[model samples]
Target: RYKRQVSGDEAYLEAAPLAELHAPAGMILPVTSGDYAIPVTNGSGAVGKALDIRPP
Candidate 1:
């Protein structure tokens, strides 16, 4: 016999606002030739992931 498996939300995480978890990576400058902009991020989830779990 064979069986297929599926998973979802495998990792538990703290539900918090993006601002609380991560800070802006850097400043975004506007270009004279374009009318679009992109935000930067300098933070990673490693720190947050560490803090999310208790000593197990």
Candidate 2:
């Protein structure tokens, strides 16, 4: 499981109105920059293959 930045509402997530769930280094999704390791579970009560983001 991984949390990546995206420009669209692909799957399950909570993101901003403008930007997507980018990376820590500022990278968008569906780009496949490289291998990223994310948590299988989070503190926000989220599960499964998911990603979350906030406003830019």
Candidate 3:
């Protein structure tokens, strides 16, 4: 089971989906271009609608 630790009244939202589905072995990460976010999906349904991950 996955356990999450929270302190005080603070709440956290998942900005991005877990890397497991999106990042598979032997797959290269894509570079983002001007004014657009990358869409990611998997068996878990629509995960990240727009991911701004890029090579720096």
Candidate 4:
């Protein structure tokens, strides 16, 4: 159980949990790493754990 309140680009990973439980169906993990990566829940599971996403 974890939560991340990050800012700027690539900041989400700093606070997001390293891993998480099983994600729901049709999940999409958002990854903030580039120019305009913001704080987003993505789809189902937590960040950097179940979902898999990247910057725009």
Candidate 5:
């Protein structure tokens, strides 16, 4: 008998945007000659709660 294959929401996720890290890694300028442009976020931006489920 052959092993069963597995898959996830690849089809759905393809149309959706993937996860990303908007948090600040560290304070450091790049070695190359380019303007530094990035978002400055705090814990509030990432912190969330589903204590009350309010769907749209």
Candidate 6:
């Protein structure tokens, strides 16, 4: 229902509903993110999210 990169080194979020995301059965899409963190979809369900991947 909502998507945006409120804060991150170099990030952006795009919402591709199941329809477009299913265009390709293989389920592969090009992603471009630099540093800090990347996106992660919870093993199942539509509750996908990201994390603060900054290294210590």
Task: Choose the strongest candidate by TM-score.
Answer: 6
List TM-score per model, in order: 0.16, 0.15, 0.20, 0.15, 0.18, 0.23
Candidate that scores best on lDDT = 4
Instruction: At residue 36, give the lDDT of candidate 1.
Output: 59
- Tens digits of lDDT, candidate 3, 1-56: 47665645323456665543366589788865747554655546323533334668
- Runs off by more than 4 Å, candidate 2: 1-30, 42-56
Per-residue C-alpha lDDT of model 1 across residues 1-56, encoded as one tens digit per residue? 36656745546466765442334569654435535543667987666435554466
- Segments in model 4 whose C-alpha atoms lie over 4 Å from true places: 1-22, 34-56
Clashes of each: 2, 3, 0, 0, 0, 0
Stretches > 4 Å off in candidate 6: 1-9, 20-50
Candidates sorted on TM-score, descending? 6, 3, 5, 1, 2, 4
Give the per-residue lDDT digits (tens) of candidate 2, residues 1-56. Answer: 38766655455555545433646667654665457754455557655345446557
Off by over 4 Å in 3: 1-21, 38-56
lDDT of 6 by residue, 16-42 (tens): 654223346677767746575546655
Ranked by lDDT, the better of candidates 3 and 4 is 4
Query: Which residues of candidate 1, in runs, are more than 4 Å off?
Result: 1-38, 44-46, 52-56
Q: Residue 24's C-alpha lDDT in candidate 5?
A: 57
Give the Cα RMSD of candidate 6: 13.6
- What TM-score, to 2 decimals, does candidate 1 have? 0.16
User: What residue pairs are clashing in model 6?
Assistant: none
lDDT of 2: 0.54
Better of 4 and 6 by TM-score: 6
Better of 3 and 5 by lDDT: 3
Query: Least accurate stretch of 10 residues (summed lDDT) in model 1?
Result: 16-25
